[PDB]
Symmetry: D3
Subunit: 203 residues, 6 copies
């Protein structure tokens, strides 16, 4: 099934499975940074996002890095249905990214596409930071964006992106090669989704 | 200062604040159970829920156990306006709880009321288990309800409580004095809300 | 439970129960008209609506004529919460009914209140015809309002009442003492709710 | 669209409803008792179209054909005509190996809502055929309460847990039982507001 | 996107709004008085694009061209850019033989919302052309209250009865009356919050 | 008879709009230049009612008075008449010590929407008075684009974050600057579709 570690380690408690998946994927995130692999990823495309997703979740989620084949929703919002996900990703690949407005709009469209069965939030926040670094020489200090504010802004974003754009704009930092900003952002990004067991840099 | 530990322990990292609040409130939950205090609470009333909330969150959330003074929402759903909280809680105190249909309806209305600024989910799930134990001689084995299923069902519940009802009925157990069921349920209930650092029985 | 005939007569097929409830309640509607009792009902108040509802559904619906104690919804519209239902009804009793605009607004508010667990549509349409008869010397020729148009307009009416006002306006007739108009209207009103087995004037 | 309204000069909504119920239920009874139902392609729009035409030929104009107008129920907009064809192309390729996949496929076909009218009844017959082929089960529709079913279908474009739960709990292995089929036709029609006839009495 | 903001260095929103109103209403008056409006393809996106460019080429970047950004009003998300082409080609093939079909076509074109801005005013001109050609009618827009029209358009993706009713009760056979056209331009701009000028005084 | 300036026969919506703008903007200018604005209770429905009456008596029937009908915009239903009074009572007791509390109070007053019309313009004047008293700030409304403001207000019953950001970045310490007040009146009316007059030229 989708959680490849669930049967492998015979785990029947939701919290223990959550902790193990957090540990493995954060190990992978730490390696992605410390190996320098994060600097050799295509920026602003679904190919780069797919690479990030596979890197984080290979041997954790079945078909990591590959588009889902099932329709999904959060709250009352239906993400792009599978039937046109391909064309959605093509359109996102050609969207411009020369200023904060365009980059945030591109991030919002990629969240609407929501191409994977799981792991969209964490992978796409890494992807967004790479776009911001390449184009604005900034990255997000994610700790400066309150979790509940971020989630509300993303819920609002398919209709209007002003909330998420304001939060991102006020969280930007020029410390784009600072390892500490990256690792703290990984921990905050995982906390957004309900993973709080590990610090990435202690793995 | 709603997060009373933030200034007291000078915490500037969201994840660190989340972890300390989890530890303190889970210590309080373990004490609530092991002291037998949980057995001397009024069942199915706002008095009992307020007692549970204060017990869990005193010196963590300002005004623990007391009704909020601000309006709040999650997703697209606006909880009961502050101006009607009093009458909402009065109505809920009068709701019957003789079978699963009525108990689930009462739980759904209490979630709609959402009387506290924070901590509604965890406190109200403890409260619900007490109602089920008293009236049906059952409690919920929360690990049998998947987190995303639970959250979607609660989002659905103000419109129809069928989704939540099924989840609950399929998770009921007669092990109403099983400490392991209670503690595992505390851990799963906190996991529902994004706290995964501690096991309650290890504190 | 709520359908008293299910346990009373041990009917476990939904369609058979539906047919028996249609027969009994249409017998009651026919008696309500032919006895002249309909002419001695208070017009435009919840007292009159409750009298109609009890008359139709006594020994069919538990607590016929009495306000519901649980919250209900249709589609994604939540009708008036129980916690202020009485206040809503007290407001509706004082709403004016001097012309078509005001009568339609009053009908729309009564549908929002939706005071009974079931039977709101049929009872409140009888109630509305009485208001129109008293104040405008008109009643609705319900066959002139298409079922799907009526249902769509009622779904729209809590936001804007133009659709339902238009349909009603176009279907008004001055034959306010014509028995065939009344009986045909009973049949169409039940057809709106999915009852098609009987003609009321054949009972 | 209602071809019988002009033909029999009917001006009462309820009598038109009754005549359409009688004729289409006669067609459903024939579909089962003639054995035609057993040679319908399972799980494709081709099969659904065959069912819809069989039921509603000379009742609905263009029975068996995709609608050309957009439609909605409540505040839910069904698949726009502009990509309906594509929506059907995708549904034909959806897997149907377990209850999860079959329910997801049924939910997508309901979202597509390919016909002007008659989507509910035709697609419930279609769903039973899929369940019969892949799970050796069919739905005992009387075990699914009408209001629960309608609410679950309203919920299903967002989350299909409600409808999945209801279907799962209503499955029976009596996949060639004529009474189960006929009662299911009557309950399926009752869902949509037709209560005049019992199909096996026609 | 607003070319006149940088061109005339305007930093007051109201001042910019007035200048955009004046320039586009001058263009609308010329579109009518030159007879150019009579030589536009009726009922197609090509004609709508011509109207939009004619009104706004000096005001909006890429006037007459489909937008490249996704947009929304209220809680309604208009057709995604990725589908605009297929949506517009579908709209080009929609019939327009009676009021039902014409209103449905207008509703779909509003859902498509092909331009970044100016959809309301341009598409109302386009709609009158269709009504003039096919029904020998145009809309007397002053007979449709602004708030009723806006609510009806908000409702129209779900059900088009409100807007159909308003349009039907506002139709006039004065299809060549210059004052009906000019007053309609003024009312159409008023719908969108431009009230500074009368078009026929420019 | 709600639009007191209206008459019998067909009225032109645009001219009525212009006349109502002129009269109410004259009243707003007088409210400021007479110093009457300085004598208004701050942060209460009493003060809001005074503002609404001052702007709109002889324009709207029952200016300064609570509406008696339920109203909606988009798909949002404002506070029902049935509890409007309790809601205003609650709003009178809400704190206003910082921007978070003041924006929350403004958002609740907009949800209450106590008047039949004129809620936007009157309540924005009211909000500026609260901000002036408690923060020594007012809004430079020209710094908030119309479409951003309207979207943020649509969002505000769910989350006030959008509107709070816009207000926060538009605050100015020029709390007794006549230019800021008059420009803000013009922008506030522009938000609602009135663009004919400049207030200080009346
Ligand atoms: N209601 C919503 N509408 C749109 N986007 C949402 C909604 N809720 C959450 N999101 C986005 O989806 C992300 C979570 O996606 P998910 O697939 O669960 O990723 P992960 O596995 O990393 O948690 C959130 O971080 C947020 O960006
Ligand atoms: N969209 C929603 N609609 C209704 N109820 C919700 C929604 N989202 C979450 N909930 C309920 O609110 C609870 C969380 O409330 P919250 O005040 O955050 O408590 P806690 O501090 O324990 O997390 C969830 O457990 C769920 O039951
Ligand atoms: N989505 C909706 N929103 C508001 N009102 C509705 C909606 N759907 C139906 N209604 C109204 O509710 C009535 C049905 O009420 P119900 O309690 O089912 O009465 P009955 O038992 O007579 O069918 C319909 O006739 C219609 O007037
Ligand atoms: N709001 C909704 N959202 C999604 N699906 C719905 C909604 N309302 C009804 N449905 C589905 O549509 C079906 C009815 O479609 P319809 O075309 O009217 O068929 P029929 O002519 O057989 O009644 C229902 O059985 C239900 O499955
Ligand atoms: N919530 C909504 N849903 C659907 N359509 C809408 C909505 N709000 C406005 N519209 C339509 O959009 C038009 C406005 O489009 P816009 O691109 O702003 O045109 P303009 O620049 O001419 O004002 C309105 O006239 C109305 O027809
Ligand atoms: N959909 C909506 N939801 C919440 N608030 C809204 C919505 N639409 C408009 N508003 C608020 O209502 C105001 C308009 O109120 P209205 O009574 O028309 O006042 P006015 O007569 O001054 O224009 C807007 O300025 C905005 O603040
Ligand atoms: Ca997540
Ligand atoms: Ca740890
Ligand atoms: Ca929570
Ligand atoms: Ca730990
Ligand atoms: Ca009904
Ligand atoms: Ca019969
Ligand atoms: Ca139907
Ligand atoms: Ca019969
Ligand atoms: Ca506009
Ligand atoms: Ca002028
Ligand atoms: Ca307005
Ligand atoms: Ca002027």
């Amino acid at each position: 099934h989708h959680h490849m570690l669930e049967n492998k380690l015979g785990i029947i408690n939701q919290l223990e499975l959550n902790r193990v998946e957090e540990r493995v994927s954060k190990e992978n995130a730490k390696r992605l940074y410390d190996s320098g692999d994060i600097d050799r990823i295509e920026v602003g495309t679904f190919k780069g996002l797919s690479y990030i997703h596979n890197y984080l979740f290979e041997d954790i989620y079945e078909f990591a890095g590959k588009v889902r084949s099932q329709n999904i929703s959060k709250g009352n919002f239906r993400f792009a249905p599978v039937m046109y996900l391909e064309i959605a990703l093509e359109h996102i690949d050609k969207m411009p990214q020369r200023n904060l407005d365009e980059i945030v709009a591109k991030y919002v469209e990629m969240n609407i596409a929501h191409p994977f069965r799981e792991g969209n939030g964490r992978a796409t926040r890494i992807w967004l930071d790479l776009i911001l670094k390449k184009e604005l020489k900034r990255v997000v200090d994610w700790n400066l964006i309150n979790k509940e504010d971020y989630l509300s802004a993303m819920e609002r974003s398919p209709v209007k992106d002003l909330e998420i754009k304001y939060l991102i704009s006020n969280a930007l930092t020029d410390k784009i090669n600072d390892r500490e900003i990256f690792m703290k952002g990984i921990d905050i990004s995982y906390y957004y989704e309900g993973y709080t067991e590990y610090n990435v840099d202690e793995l």
